[PDB]
Amino acid sequence: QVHLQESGPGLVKPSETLSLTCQVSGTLVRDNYWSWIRQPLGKQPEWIGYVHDSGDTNYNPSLKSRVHLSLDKSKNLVSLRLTGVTAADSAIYYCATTKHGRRIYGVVAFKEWFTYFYMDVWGKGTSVTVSSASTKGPSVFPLAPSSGTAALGCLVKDYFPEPVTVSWNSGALTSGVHTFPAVLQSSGLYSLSSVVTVPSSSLGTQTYICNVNHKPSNTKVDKRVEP
Amino acid sequence: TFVSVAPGQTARITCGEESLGSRSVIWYQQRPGQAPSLIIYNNNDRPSGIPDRFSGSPGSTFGTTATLTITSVEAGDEADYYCHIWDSRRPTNWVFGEGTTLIVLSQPKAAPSVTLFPPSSEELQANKATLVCLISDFYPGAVTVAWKADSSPVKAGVETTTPSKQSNNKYAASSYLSLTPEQWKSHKSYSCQVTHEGSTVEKTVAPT
Amino acid sequence: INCTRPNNNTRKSIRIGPGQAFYATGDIIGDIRQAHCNVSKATWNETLGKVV
Amino acid sequence: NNITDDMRGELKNCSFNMTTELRDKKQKVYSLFYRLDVVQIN
Ligand SMILES: *[C@@H]1O[C@H](CO)[C@@H](O[C@@H]2O[C@H](CO)[C@@H](O[C@@H]3O[C@H](CO[C@H]4O[C@H](CO[C@H]5O[C@H](CO)[C@@H](O)[C@H](O)[C@@H]5O)[C@@H](O)[C@H](O[C@H]5O[C@H](CO)[C@@H](O)[C@H](O)[C@@H]5O[C@H]5O[C@H](CO)[C@@H](O)[C@H](O)[C@@H]5O)[C@@H]4O)[C@@H](O)[C@H](O[C@H]4O[C@H](CO)[C@@H](O)[C@H](O)[C@@H]4O[C@H]4O[C@H](CO)[C@@H](O)[C@H](O)[C@@H]4O[C@H]4O[C@H](CO)[C@@H](O)[C@H](O)[C@@H]4O)[C@@H]3O)[C@H](O)[C@H]2NC(C)=O)[C@H](O)[C@H]1NC(C)=O
Ligand SMILES: *[C@@H]1O[C@H](CO)[C@@H](O[C@@H]2O[C@H](CO)[C@@H](O[C@@H]3O[C@H](CO[C@H]4O[C@H](CO[C@H]5O[C@H](CO)[C@@H](O)[C@H](O)[C@@H]5O)[C@@H](O)[C@H](O[C@H]5O[C@H](CO)[C@@H](O)[C@H](O)[C@@H]5O)[C@@H]4O)[C@@H](O)[C@H](O[C@H]4O[C@H](CO)[C@@H](O)[C@H](O)[C@@H]4O)[C@@H]3O)[C@H](O)[C@H]2NC(C)=O)[C@H](O)[C@H]1NC(C)=O
Ligand SMILES: *[C@@H]1O[C@H](CO)[C@@H](O[C@@H]2O[C@H](CO)[C@@H](O[C@@H]3O[C@H](CO)[C@@H](O)[C@H](O[C@H]4O[C@H](CO)[C@@H](O)[C@H](O)[C@@H]4O)[C@@H]3O)[C@H](O)[C@H]2NC(C)=O)[C@H](O)[C@H]1NC(C)=O
Ligand SMILES: *[C@@H]1O[C@H](CO)[C@@H](O[C@@H]2O[C@H](CO)[C@@H](O)[C@H](O)[C@H]2NC(C)=O)[C@H](O)[C@H]1NC(C)=O
Ligand SMILES: *[C@@H]1O[C@H](CO)[C@@H](O[C@@H]2O[C@H](CO)[C@@H](O)[C@H](O)[C@H]2NC(C)=O)[C@H](O)[C@H]1NC(C)=O
Ligand SMILES: *[C@@H]1O[C@H](CO)[C@@H](O)[C@H](O)[C@H]1NC(C)=O
Ligand SMILES: *[C@@H]1O[C@H](CO)[C@@H](O)[C@H](O)[C@H]1NC(C)=O
């Protein structure tokens, strides 16, 4: 076997309609239950809702009046819809099969038995960013060495969105290079750094230049670092 | 929450509120950078492929929290574990409980390499300032950064990344401090105090 | 026949005072089920059949 | 509980004022009563 593949836009403006599609392979969409689970960065997974082919379908009470699910039996895939999106919906959406079970504790005749669901087969998942903000070009600033080894690096401040590919001397030097993950500021802009362990004996000053590339703004900045 | 257990020992994980009725707790394991996987459904029933090292507390106990026992703790079990509470007394939970991270105690000691860079001269001309604190070569991935203005701590403007190991055991963490050109020339010096495990390394920086 | 009350209950002893105390049902511990009584189907079928 | 609506409540969680040992102070305590024991007005 069972392979699941999610697919979506990746970027959504606010107050719009997000549309996702879960391509199902190895089984039919009619003989199984299907659930969607989103997960913010650094948060616990939040259940969106479950859908069945017959017409049985329930949503998350917190997102009840905004979500819509459906199943295409002709193309055998799952489709999600979310109207009125904001910055809170920015997460990673997974598609997953769902098996039902029945927990009996009292006397089944009187009800007192609740059905529990659990997902066994997950998919790779799709990343969805619902950020309104336009594309901003990065600002490169050199990090000069500060008083047999020495440290030397760059700084990529205020850019959007991810990612940023950082090389040194067009890939001529590939040793001692350490690029840190970016951090999202309160402004909604990311900022990363890249530092390299360099010999203190670099009096010759053979050209040292980090190459910064930002494809969403087509911005390629080559900065020369000098003490 | 974090739980550190020596390899080969026994790990125990607590999640969600106290039981009010008969439960049917569903456990999930999330390897970092992957999708969550099923471990134990229906209190203590493990599906195919899952070792019996994973056991869960029975959902017939009233007044106790759900407990996940992991015998023979190995390095591969180091991940995030979330739980799905199904109580007969509570409504359907559409949100998993707060997960718990399992820490395998091995490879214990690595001294953190911190480095503090002052704001560049070119950034100050753009009416901006930023202190950079790079932290590398440390294990395990669990550090906390506290900035200092002279002897006074800094409350806002602190932006810190989450640890991330590379090829080496070394982990990655960068701490930034957004200030104004006026704030930089104000105080005498700024400090970058990094607390790792039990020790704390402090590096300072002064204007010219 | 067997009759039971599934709801294991809590007594709350609120004091109206001075020496007079009212006993109130506290919170239930366990599941919410209703009282019921069981009658052996075989025993009842024969018993009714002997009466008729 | 977690009820569809066919359970018709039956059990009620009532809160009310009460006279304590002293005359002056009221008591805001809660109890549990069956539906056959209570009746709503208006
Ligand atoms: C008046 O008349 C009415 C109507 O007749 C009557 O109403 C009846 O009331 C009783 C109690 O009030 C009620 O009993 C409940 O039944 C629940 C379901 O039991 C039945 O199903 C199971 C499993 O069936 C599933 O799985 C099958 C595959 O295995 C599958 O094919 C099925 O389709 C289905 O999916 C079945 O095993 C049971 O069979 C029992 O009875 C047989 C005799 O008929 C007997 O031969 C069997 O051996 C078995 O008895 C026990 O056997 C071993 C011991 O040898 C035990 O280990 C078993 O667990 C059996 O009890 C039934 O056909 C049942 O789940 C309820 O029990 C759970 O819930 C209570 C309350 O929360 C807990 O306190 C219990 O501890 C128990 O919880 C365990 O099980 C659940 C579910 O698996 C787990 O989630 C829990 O975590 C826990 O399991 C863990 O903890 C235990 C702790 O010891 C541990 O041992 C485990 O290993 C695990 O770690 C409960 O018993 C009944 O449904 C109801 N209706 C009927 C028709 O009877 C009134 O009572 C009458 N009143 C009076 C006054 O007479
Ligand atoms: C029907 O409902 C009723 C209630 O409506 C419920 O009543 C229970 O009845 C049982 C049996 O009579 C009680 O079990 C006993 O509880 C004793 C007290 O439990 C508490 O105190 C423990 C510490 O005891 C000392 O310390 C406290 C102060 O800290 C002091 O007041 C005590 O007097 C005593 O000196 C405490 O540890 C315990 O909490 C534990 O358990 C919960 C899970 O329940 C767990 O989450 C906690 O982390 C902790 O592990 C609790 O707070 C207790 O002393 C006694 O233990 C001894 O006796 C048993 C045998 O009965 C031995 O097996 C055991 O090894 C000890 O020697 C025992 O556990 C229970 O407390 C009542 N419950 C309540 C809420 O009052 C019935 O169970 C219900 N019936 C059914 C069928 O469902
Ligand atoms: C808390 O209470 C809510 C009540 O709102 C409850 O959710 C409900 O679950 C029932 C099933 O347990 C749902 O009823 C379903 O209705 C659809 C049609 O819309 C049917 O297709 C379903 O039938 C399947 O499930 C049955 C139950 O075992 C099977 O017997 C049958 O063979 C089918 O497999 C089913 O009848 C109902 O729609 C929901 N309601 C809502 C609002 O979601 C919830 O389960 C309770 N949770 C706990 C922990 O008590
Ligand atoms: C009512 O309860 C009694 C006991 O509480 C039941 O008698 C038991 O019957 C079983 C057979 O199913 C025997 O194994 C037990 O030894 C009996 N108990 C005693 C104390 O004798 C009786 O069957 C129940 N009847 C109904 C209709 O529920
Ligand atoms: C119990 O008594 C208190 C009075 O001490 C009630 O509180 C008042 O309620 C009335 C309306 O019922 C309000 O207009 C007052 O403002 C409340 N506060 C006072 C009078 O200080 C309380 O509502 C009672 N609880 C019940 C009847 O369940
Ligand atoms: C037992 O009861 C059924 C109806 O429940 C009835 O048809 C049948 O005749 C009864 N058996 C005897 C022997 O009376
Ligand atoms: C209690 O549940 C019943 C179920 O039918 C419902 O009609 C009623 O509005 C509920 N009341 C409260 C206060 O929850």
Quick check: C32 and B88 CB within 8 A?
A: yes
Of B81, B104, B127, at which residue does a domain stop? B104
CATH number at residue B137: 2.60.40.10
Task: For ligand 1, atom 66, name the residue with the nearest CA.
Answer: A105
Closest-CA distance of chain D to residue A191, Å:
47
**How many other C-beta atoms lie within 10 A of the C-beta of residue A215?**
10
Token readout for A92 is: 């990673």
- Domain region containing B179: 105-207
Best to test chain C binding among B18, B24, B62 (most C CBs inside 10 Å): B62
Where does ligand 7 bind, in terms of residues with CB under 6 Å?
A: D 5, 8-9
Give the torsion sign (CA, D18, D21, D26, D29). Answer: negative
B21 Cα–ligand 4 center, Å: 27
Q: In this structure, what token pair is assigned to residue B176?
A: 């930034």
Is the Cβ of B88 closer than 8 Å to some Cβ of chain C?
yes
Residue D14 main-chain phi, psi, to 5 deg: -95, 135
Experimentally determined by: X-ray
CA C7/CA C10 separation, integer angstroms = 10
What number of other Cβ atoms are within 10 A of residue A97's Cβ? 19
Write out chain C residues lying below 8 Å of D33, CB-based: 25
**Integer CA distances (angstroms), A58 to A89, A92, A187, B92, in order:** 19, 21, 37, 11
Buried-exposed string B15-29: b where 16+ CB fall within 10 A, e elsewhere: bbeebbbbbbbbbbb
Residue C41 CA to ligand 4 center (angstroms) comes to 13
Return the number of other C-beta atoms located less than 10 Å from residue C44's C-beta. Answer: 11
Pair of tokens at residue B205: 């920086």
DSSP B53: T
Report yes or no: A94 and B68 within 8 Å, Cβ to Cβ: no
Same structural domain, B95 and B112: no
| Nearest ligand to residue D7 Cα | 7
Amino acid occupying residue B28: Y
Q: B15 near B65, Cβ under 8 Å?
A: yes
Q: Does D38 touch chain C (CB under 8 A)?
A: no
Last residue of one domain, picked from the residues B104, B119, B149: B104
**Could you tell me if B83 and B110 lie in one domain?**
no
Sign of the CA dihedral running A142, A145, A148, A149: negative
Q: For residue B194, which phi and psi values (nearest 5 degrees)?
A: -110, 115
DSSP, collapsed to helix, strand or coil, labels residue A55 as coil
Clarify whether residues B57 and B132 are in a common domain. no
- Identify the chains in contact with D, defined as 3+ C-beta pairs within 8 A: A, B, C
- B10 and B100 in a single domain? The answer is yes
R_g over Cα of chain B: 22
What's this structure's resolution in Å?
4.4
Length of chain A: 227
Tell me, yes or no, whether B30 and B75 share the same domain. yes
Q: Looking at the structure, tell me whether residues B89 and B39 fall in a common domain.
A: yes
Strands (E), chain B: 2-5, 10-18, 26-30, 37-40, 54-56, 65-71, 80-84, 100-104, 113-117, 129-136, 143-149, 152-153, 158-160, 173-179, 190-196, 199-205
Whether the Cβ atoms of residue B39 and residue B50 lie closer than 8 Å to each other? yes
Name, in order, each residue with C-beta under 8 angstroms of D2's C-beta and a sequence gap of 6 or more. Answer: A114, B87, B88, B89, B90, B91, B92
Closest CA to B101 of B140, B138, B159, B134: B140
Q: Are residues B111 and B100 in the same domain?
A: no
Beta strands in A8-66 (DSSP E): 17-25, 33-39, 46-52, 57-59
What's the rounded Cα separation, in Å, for the pair C6 and C31?
A: 8
B132 vs B123: CA distance, rounded Å: 13
Check residue B137 and report its DSSP letter: S
Helix (H, G, I), strand (E, B) or coil at A42: coil
Ligand 6 binding site (Cβ under 6 Å of any ligand atom): C 45, 49
**Ligand 5 binding pocket includes D33 (Cβ within 6 Å):** no
Q: Are B49 and B147 in a shared domain?
A: no
Minimal CA separation from C19 to chain B, in Å: 34
CA of A113 to the centre of ligand 7 (A): 20
Task: Kindly state the tokens that stand for B98.
Answer: 């707060």
C-alpha angle B151/B153/B154, rounded to 5°? 135
Residue among B20, B133, B161 with most chain A CBs within 10 A, to mutate? B161
Q: CA B55 → CA B11, B32, B45, B99, D8, distances in Å?
A: 11, 22, 8, 17, 38
CB contact under 8 A, C24 and D20: no
D36 class by beta-carbon count within 10 Å (0-12 exposed, 13-18 middle, 19+ buried): exposed
Q: Find tokens 């209950």 and name the residue.
A: C9
Handedness of CA B39, B40, B46, B51 (dihedral sign): positive
Residue B179 contacts residue B155 (beta carbons within 8 Å): no
Percent of chain B that is helix, strand, coil (3-state, to 5) = 5, 45, 50
d(CA C3, ligand 6 centre) in Å = 24
Q: Of the bound ligands, which one is closest to the alpha carbon of residue C12?
A: 2
Number of domains in chain B: 2
Q: How far apart are CA A30 and CA A53, in angstroms?
A: 5
Q: Is the CB of residue D2 less than 8 Å away from at least one CB of chain A?
A: yes
